[PDB]
Symmetry: C6
Subunit: 30 residues, 6 copies
């Protein structure tokens, strides 16, 4: 439903942010 799906979309966008931030960290110290 509208609210459950909105929170899922927020979680998914934050997982994409987390992946990219780990890629940036890994470029500096991996």
């Amino acid at each position: 439903g509208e609210i459950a799906q909105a929170l899922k979309e927020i979680a998914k966008a934050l997982k994409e942010c987390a992946w990219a931030l780990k890629e940036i960290a890994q470029a500096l110290k991996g």
Copy 2:
């Protein structure tokens, strides 16, 4: 509705964050 539309705007902004962070990761990767 007001709550649904605010949660949609939060998801949209986070997707823009995610895309920019992917571009920063791409710039730093070998």
Copy 3:
């Protein structure tokens, strides 16, 4: 409207985060 205004302030802050991240990505791109 306390709940709606707090979600709108979260969206506003994330839009500022997205603007700044896009500025960082542009600074690093060719």
Copy 4:
């Protein structure tokens, strides 16, 4: 109340994130 204050605290933490991201962008292109 518990939920209104929690969302305010989330907005405040995101404003601090936004300020720091703008400082990073400004260090690169200001």
Copy 5:
């Protein structure tokens, strides 16, 4: 528990973001 699980996935993703940001900060510090 769909609403609680989506908020917990948001927290999980943000903890991953925080870990990666701390790794970036450590890479840049003296």
Copy 6:
């Protein structure tokens, strides 16, 4: 309660993001 505790964990993680981003900003500033 479950919703209150998830929102507290989201705020805590974002404060950790904010602190790390402040440290990255400090590293890059003159």
